[model samples]
Target: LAKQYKNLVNGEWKLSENEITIYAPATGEELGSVPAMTQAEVDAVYASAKKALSDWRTLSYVERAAYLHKAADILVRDAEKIGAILSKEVAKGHKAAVSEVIRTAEIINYAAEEGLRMEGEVLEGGSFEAASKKKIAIVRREPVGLVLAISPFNYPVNLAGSKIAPALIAGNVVALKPPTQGSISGLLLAEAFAEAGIPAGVFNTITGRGSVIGDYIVEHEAVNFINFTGSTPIGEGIGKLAGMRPIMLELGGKDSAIVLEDADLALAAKNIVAGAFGYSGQRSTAVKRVLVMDKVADQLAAEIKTLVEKLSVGMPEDDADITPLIDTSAADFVEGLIKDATDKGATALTAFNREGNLISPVLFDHVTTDMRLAWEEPFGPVLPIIRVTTVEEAIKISNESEYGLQASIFTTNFPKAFGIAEQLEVGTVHLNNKTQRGTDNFPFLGAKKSGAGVQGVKYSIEAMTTVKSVVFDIQ
Candidate 1:
């Protein structure tokens, strides 16, 4: 990696003595290298963050919101340059890379406006007030001190922005530890906030392996909150060590697209394929399963197969429909699952092909829940479909999983769609749309073991704060 990205500590750039190289997965080209921050350095940053929080908390909500809005403006102003950097580092499709940067801006925009909207309560003192004649109780929201944001590689910018923006807007100082694979990530994000004129020590960005710098930040008593977006097992591990501190986890999702017998095959096929294979299905909300009624299964499968065949898969900056996984090993893991499925009597309607880190999209037929792909989250572009005869069977199949992040139902039968929406065990359900549909302010959550807390621009701000009740005596 020729390009070097440094860490920002106490609002100053600090180049680590060591570095981690980043590569463009599809082409095996060096993207960049990021400074490898040490645990000692992170602990020192935490000290700075605690001092910053004392001063930052003195700023009113309006003051903090202004910084977030300015940050959004900076992001939009450098969209192209930032987008190019993001695509090269993360290996997402060019269009997706651009879209994610804008999405991050939108999250900041919403956070700025929503920061002033957090509501506490004016409690009446209820029964105690009834006896006292006159009494008033006010409940107010206050910042939860320092935040440690551990973001995922699949959505480095958007997720990082979602957590960091709100934490700052909510009057908390932050020490963000970005994904190790997200090269130049801390630099890119630090540049935006720094250009926005964030106060020194208010926001700090670090880089290194999570197992080292990240875990130290989590276990440290100086940190008051932890916001993370990644897998379940890791989140569980973090939770055990977090103790009384609040830890928000936006974990994995095995979301699905359920097509009914009366659905429009063409539209369903188009949306399903688009949702399933976007950026090679790296998104947590991507459609991992397509459940169709047996009456239209054969027809819809053919249409979906045709759709997949049309997609051009290769380099991310080339703007291909499917890009590479994080690296060759990620491709190997997905391929292993595919081979395991085919070995267990499933048919690979679309076979897996590879070069460097690029893995061709694969769609399987005649696959059962017993197959590895059925339960495992394939962060690659591989579709595993399940066919059912009834709406009840579809709902039954959907709920029979440890994950319940998001799911969608496609049907002309409005009543049936609504019926299943209430019954489906996922966090959010869409009607006649893909499973990945969501806006900036929606209370995006992962049900079951998927997520531990609610997330979004507005909701995340609330989550980073704690409510304290203040009651006064009437004399």
Candidate 2:
């Protein structure tokens, strides 16, 4: 039942001379093999996408929408299989993986519905009768040709679909470069697109090291746009290389959660624990830091510490509350941060370590602002708690970081919540919940180093297309 997947180029599954073996982070066992796409292979895909852009862009909106709908149907048919593959590859539990697949399917369906609804608007051309006899004006939205979609390993299917579905639905040919760890799921997506009867080269999946193939895709003259979701450093490089072309970058987040005096301490603790450690703090919007008022800091930290201690850290297949780090490198990085913080006088109030890769959640208190763990994004299950006197101090501390992705304010007073929300330098703000929560229906993107653009279905569609104005004169 397990089949090795190859790179998809120009409607064909092509093999490369080089190959990579993805491993299960939990057991460090080989999950499956994926092709390492060479420069030649990447070139072929670029050429094919270049050649097909004209025809693909010419397709009617209704036709493209129908094809997207078909793709969603195919994804539904293989949801369970795809979910299993994802769980094996990324150390995500079965239930979490299934939810990702289901969400991806829903994203495709939503994109299809939006694509079918694409329409132009008409405006009255001139208000002054003396200036012009009569005039009519119309505005139209047009696809921006070929798009290079680069996605990360976390939430592979959902993130990839977030870019691919909107671009394809907007009538743009896409060259998808999925993270190597999640290549199998990306191939499944290609199969779904093919099953939907999309034209050759309309949707292609290129698998390889991002460093090797990423620049080529960005610099390719045929690629009119770039949609990237990864770290801030890489996102900056891609943004620079994209030149004049449109680039949508979803980058890093060092988001924070602020707890006020009047907020529910127990409920805030529960929500913050879930947001900070639920996905082992791997998500971009996860609450990397908590800024609590000094009055409630002791009690709130106690409740959160208890919850973190109870988290189950096990293999991906075990359905544990916590799983192994995505890879050894990530685990090592997190360990280093934890050690460095401890060395700098921060207290690791609770520490849990399982196998080499499995790290139980850890919470740090007495963390100072100068520490790297507090200023930078950890991208792990370690949550740093910093105490402040007032809501203004909390907002100041939260806004001090370079990243401006998300921030949550826990407060009962609407005025205070809104005031803090307005001042925090982040893209999305949650009034009463943790910073990690987000919905696809709302536009999501970061400010500053976090990212460059917004990415909801409708918003992303606008990012992938251009607006044009038509004018007419009548006597």
Candidate 3:
């Protein structure tokens, strides 16, 4: 039997009879378990968060920021141990897992400091209103009460931290629900918050199936704002249920890399390979589609093929370039996408091989618009090269997809790159590089099916708050 982990509910480490067993994705060995909490327990967490908000929101921004900084310290102090937990649960390489935990700490520190830097302003009432100059408006942002944060299994720690830090620094209490498979890592994060002496009910963690508690928590009246990062379908479901509340969602993407004829084929190939295959292309910002001009498609395809052939495959503990996926079902889904594309006319550049949950990287060429790989997000170690005759065609194919998170433009001519970038429909366009995120301060968002709202430190704080205006008669 695996050791059972406890949830941080209202400052207490609580366990339950309904347990969700966890196994290492790489070895199928028992790791630990988390409680499959009930809706009634969710009600308790909600009430605690709601009650805590009165005092939490009353504190000065700088004071709240101090507490957040302490939590950051705890995350850094235990990064290695938590990274091991993350690796065992999700099969991300241990080295990368540790890096993610440290990066998450930096994000927390940044958000805390950024929240302090944020200032309110006094507005002139005579400029735009019927009021005289004697009337002034003081404008500032206030916490939106309780925030419900839902993070995915792919990036359990970082993603959860992204939401929790900003929500807490902005003086809003949080109820975080980490993914079912990665709940242990999430609980460990909550433990850091608890150890930091962040007041009781300021930050809480819950573990349970989305099917059971997702809607209940989301629809609860106490939840004033929601921050979620996960699949498109689940996001859409939450969006429907969360009718009036404000939400910040970091959802799915089918990010593409566009290579013009004059672009650096070698550089594009290397970065594209890195972006697409890193973490087995499990990231939403991974370069899932490659659109190369016909003049240099052959060369670019050859370059990618050479790099793809060199990737190392093994278990997560080995820190190989490619490792076992989070589950065998995920491997099966990627395999199905490959089959659908090959059946339609795409050519496979590498052998299609699988070892249990570990599927070797596959490269495809001659991928057309009709193939499933062209529009669907594989979220695996598969790369597709689509050749186009003109830049217009590339733009058309890239924009036609429902997702518009980010895109990459590779070209030597800066002016030309800007021109092509202006026409692409995405939240962020990278010039001569790969599509990725986590600059921490830079705005990260999705245009359409990818997601809604904005992320990053400042943006997240703003999203978690609502503007308040106090009008006063000065004279």
TM-score of each: 0.96, 0.96, 0.98
Cα deviation of 423, candidate 2, in Å: 0.8
Specify the highest-lDDT model's number. Answer: 3
| Candidate 2 residue pairs that clash | none
lDDT by residue for model 2 (1-475), tens: 4466787788888888888788777777777788888788888998888788889888888888888888888888888888888888888888898888888889988987887688888776566565653787789888898889988788888898999989988888998888888777788778888878888888888888766775786898888999999888989899789889989989889888898899898888888888888778888888889899999999988988899888888777877878888887888888888888888999787974757878878899888887778987767789899989977788888887889999877889988788778898988998788775346868898988999888888889989988788889877
Q: Residues 1-475, candidate 3, lDDT per residue (tens digit)?
A: 3678998988999997798988898998898889989999988888888888999999998899888899999999999999988988899999999998999999999999998777888988788777577888899888888999998899999999999998888888999999988899999888889999988888998888778886888888888888999999889999988998889888889998999989899999999999999999899988999999999999999999999999988988899889888887889999999999889988899888899989999999999998889998888899899999998999999999999999999998889888888988898999888998858899999989999899988999888887799988975
Q: Considering summed lDDT, which 10 consecutive residues are worst modelled in model 1? A: 125-134
Comparing 2 and 3 by lDDT, which wins?
A: 3
* Range of the 10 consecutive residues with the lowest summed lDDT in candidate 2: 124-133
Best by TM-score: 3
> Given candidate 2, what's the lDDT at residue 215?
79
Please tell me which model should have the higher TM-score, number 1 or number 3: 3
Model 2 scores a TM of 0.96
Candidate 1 local lDDT, 117-145, one digit each (tens): 77788866555656754667789889999
Query: How many Å off is the CA of 343 in candidate 2?
Result: 1.9
Q: Quote the lDDT for 169 in model 1.
A: 81
Q: What residue pairs clash in candidate 3, if any at all? A: none
